[PDB]
């Protein structure tokens, strides 16, 4: 059992995007971006408490367990549903799940993680490939292009929050994935930045780290968190999830700069994780009201359309089907 | 007094250069370029010997004294040419050319830094300002659109030697900087790879950075070189920078994974210095035989559409006198 109070609304958004309308109809979502290696992974790790592989888009559900708090896990790929038995199972059945979604670039095919626990947010969050300027190995030259081509189907929509993973060790002004988050969002009204890797900032240049996450330098309505992770040294001694948010605690505890970010409501995964389920909550709140009518008007213009070229049919009928179902599944809201 | 073996080569192109002709007249060269703090301006301090301002192109003219060895610098832009009397002095000297050259964007205008001492190599290099993506504080939006128009100025030229400056402790395949050196020079047979900030790897990372600079992540023909400048904590205590070499010296000889890279030759700017002598010299000598041909040809196209377009003429009329000139001063050569 859960808080049946902010659970209907994430449930809805959920089921509404498992039906396939997305194509046609804006949802509300937040977008995990990131560089390749800001330890964008690394941040999902932390919130879902359990170890993720080594591309396409993930839809991450997390469930806080209120009642009897035992830890169930799902995951769910094209007509695959496979119930996950412990925590340290996920990494396995993700890395099948990344099999079977991958046959020869980028798959805009979902794959869905939901874990039930205590120690997770309520949140919903959807995950896209690391981006890449510089084709290397035996990846297609195009690669780079592919992975913002699906980036900016997310991302280019009102509907969207785009969650900006940025290392601490970068020039923020140097991101790729804040650059796209500009972009789109010239205001940074609908943009969250994660700083990563505070223990790898060198030393005389951590002032420079807090100007960033005071909202100092590129400014963030919704403003900016800092987290540490795992390293690779601990990531290699298979260091526990919960002692990583121990170490986490500690570090920023003891921070000669960093403590004021901490006493400030800015700092560790369990803060990050509060303020992602209040930014959810606000987005889907704000769609709430418009989505029977935007339902309607698509409908309406998929049905002009039909119209026009046919009355290729048989596929906008199974938009149309698919409409339908999202107008039903609406209208059972909030039960 | 200096090696008049390599200096004829050097000085020759400098003062083609400086005649104004590279508008028509590709010249050989080398040209920094790096994301911003990337660590760019350390490398030109440690190479320089001198401490460099916290924009426009900059020529930096290094000039190996076997003589007397009497340190002697000098910085040109405009009509100012100042005789510099300390190394300490550098500093205040390009501050105050930065400031003449640039009234209100980027300016393509060259500030000339030439160094004569013990400790530089024979070298000239043209510093680029650092890319940036995002634009952030007073700076126009532009202003990254800006600074890859000078960059692909001189990178997009068959006779510039891209000299990329990456730090250690980001992935190389997100990299801005290499990603338009690839552009330009998809082969990768002229470019060269600076790792820089060695020790802000992260533990149990080190042997990606090993990997890189042994050129087995993305190739490059004329390799990679590692090494460590000072430190912002440094910078901050105004450490000597003969001290901060013998500080890298010492930094790789007890690293337990760079060590094989300093044994491979592939480290510290001592090393830097003498391989991009060499690779100066190898292009510079590339370019010498066609040089008169070149600009033969091209006295002859602007000679046609001199005729075409006037036979706007008296600034065509200062271009041909420019490469008049350049043939001249080529008939000289090597005296
Ligand atoms: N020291 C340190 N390392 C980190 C931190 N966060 C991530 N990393 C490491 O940085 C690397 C890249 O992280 P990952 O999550 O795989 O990056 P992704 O490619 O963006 O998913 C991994 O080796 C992590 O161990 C941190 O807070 N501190
Ligand atoms: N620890 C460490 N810091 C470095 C190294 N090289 C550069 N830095 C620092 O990184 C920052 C950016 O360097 P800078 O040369 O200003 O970057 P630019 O913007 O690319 O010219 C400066 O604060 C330097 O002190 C290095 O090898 N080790």
Request: with cysteine; glycine share 6%; hydrophobic share 35%.
């Given at each position: 059992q859960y808080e049946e109070k902010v659970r209907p609304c994430i449930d809805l958004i959920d089921s509404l995007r498992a039906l396939g309308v997305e194509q046609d109809l804006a949802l509300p979502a937040i977008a995990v971006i990131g560089d390749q290696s800001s330890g964008k992974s690394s941040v999902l790790e932390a919130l879902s408490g359990v170890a993720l592989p080594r591309r396409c888009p993930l839809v991450l559900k997390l469930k806080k367990l209120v009642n009897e708090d035992k830890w169930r896990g799902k995951v769910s790929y094209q007509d695959y549903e496979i119930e996950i038995s412990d925590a340290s199972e996920v990494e396995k059945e993700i890395n099948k799940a990344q099999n079977a979604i991958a046959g020869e670039g980028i798959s805009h095919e979902l794959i869905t993680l939901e874990i039930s626990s205590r120690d997770v947010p309520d949140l919903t969050l959807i995950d896209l490939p690391g981006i890449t300027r510089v084709a290397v190995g035996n990846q297609p030259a195009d690669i780079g292009y592919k992975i913002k081509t699906l980036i900016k189907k997310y991302?280019?929509?009102?509907?969207t929050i785009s969650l900006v993973v940025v290392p601490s060790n970068v020039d923020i002004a140097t991101t790729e994935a804040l650059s796209m988050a500009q972009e789109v969002d010239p205001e940074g009204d609908r943009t969250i930045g994660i700083l990563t890797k505070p223990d790898l900032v060198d030393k005389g240049t951590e002032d420079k780290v807090v100007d960033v996450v005071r909202n100092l330098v590129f400014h963030l309505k919704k403003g900016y968190m800092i987290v540490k992770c795992r390293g690779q040294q601990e990531i290699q001694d298979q260091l526990s999830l919960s002692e990583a948010l121990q170490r986490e605690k500690i570090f920023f505890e003891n921070h000669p700069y960093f403590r004021d970010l901490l006493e400030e409501g800015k700092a560790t995964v369990p803060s990050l994780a509060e303020k992602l389920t209040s930014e959810l909550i606000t987005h889907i709140s704000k769609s709430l009201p418009l989505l029977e009518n935007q339902i309607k008007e698509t409908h309406q213009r998929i049905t002009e359309e039909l119209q026009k070229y046919g009355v290729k049919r048989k596929f906008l009928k199974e938009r149309l089907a698919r409409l339908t179902q999202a107008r039903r599944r609406l209208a059972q809201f909030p039960g």
């Amino acid at each position: 059992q859960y808080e049946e109070k902010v659970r209907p609304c994430i449930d809805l958004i959920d089921s509404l995007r498992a039906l396939g309308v997305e194509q046609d109809l804006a949802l509300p979502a937040i977008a995990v971006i990131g560089d390749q290696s800001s330890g964008k992974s690394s941040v999902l790790e932390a919130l879902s408490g359990v170890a993720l592989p080594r591309r396409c888009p993930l839809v991450l559900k997390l469930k806080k367990l209120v009642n009897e708090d035992k830890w169930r896990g799902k995951v769910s790929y094209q007509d695959y549903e496979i119930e996950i038995s412990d925590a340290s199972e996920v990494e396995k059945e993700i890395n099948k799940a990344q099999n079977a979604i991958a046959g020869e670039g980028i798959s805009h095919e979902l794959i869905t993680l939901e874990i039930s626990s205590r120690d997770v947010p309520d949140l919903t969050l959807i995950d896209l490939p690391g981006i890449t300027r510089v084709a290397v190995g035996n990846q297609p030259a195009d690669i780079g292009y592919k992975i913002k081509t699906l980036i900016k189907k997310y991302i280019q929509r009102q509907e969207t929050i785009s969650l900006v993973v940025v290392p601490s060790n970068v020039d923020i002004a140097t991101t790729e994935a804040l650059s796209m988050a500009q972009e789109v969002d010239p205001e940074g009204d609908r943009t969250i930045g994660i700083l990563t890797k505070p223990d790898l900032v060198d030393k005389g240049t951590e002032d420079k780290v807090v100007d960033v996450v005071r909202n100092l330098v590129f400014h963030l309505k919704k403003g900016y968190m800092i987290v540490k992770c795992r390293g690779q040294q601990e990531i290699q001694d298979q260091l526990s999830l919960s002692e990583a948010l121990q170490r986490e605690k500690i570090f920023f505890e003891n921070h000669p700069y960093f403590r004021d970010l901490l006493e400030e409501g800015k700092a560790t995964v369990p803060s990050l994780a509060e303020k992602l389920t209040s930014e959810l909550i606000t987005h889907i709140s704000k769609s709430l009201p418009l989505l029977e009518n935007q339902i309607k008007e698509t409908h309406q213009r998929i049905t002009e359309e039909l119209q026009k070229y046919g009355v290729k049919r048989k596929f906008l009928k199974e938009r149309l089907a698919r409409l339908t179902q999202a107008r039903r599944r609406l209208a059972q809201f909030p039960g």
